Amino acid sequence: FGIDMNTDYTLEEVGKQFDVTRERIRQIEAKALRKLRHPSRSEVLRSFLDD
């Protein structure tokens, strides 16, 4: 995601910079997202949804 940088890179771009295939980076991103879903965490992130 484009957080704190000029551009949002493709998963293949990030893989080539980290030297890994797309599927590994995809699992890594999904791992991070799943961890961020984890209650006891992301309480405030949930608070940023107003409806």
Next chain:
Amino acid sequence: DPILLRPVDDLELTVRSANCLKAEAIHYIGDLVQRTEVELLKTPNLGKKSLTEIKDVLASRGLSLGMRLENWP
């Protein structure tokens, strides 16, 4: 209690300890604080490090073992 009824997903465990609990079939935090050290340590694939970080997260979020319950659920 708000957290004693919180399921073992909130315990911040791995899948090794997760399947340890599935082999024990404990969900709520009051339930996981029901049991003792060795009674859970005796189960398969469950050694010192598993229960160690178990008590680690317990003491980090105000829990521990040797506890007991009355009318739970």
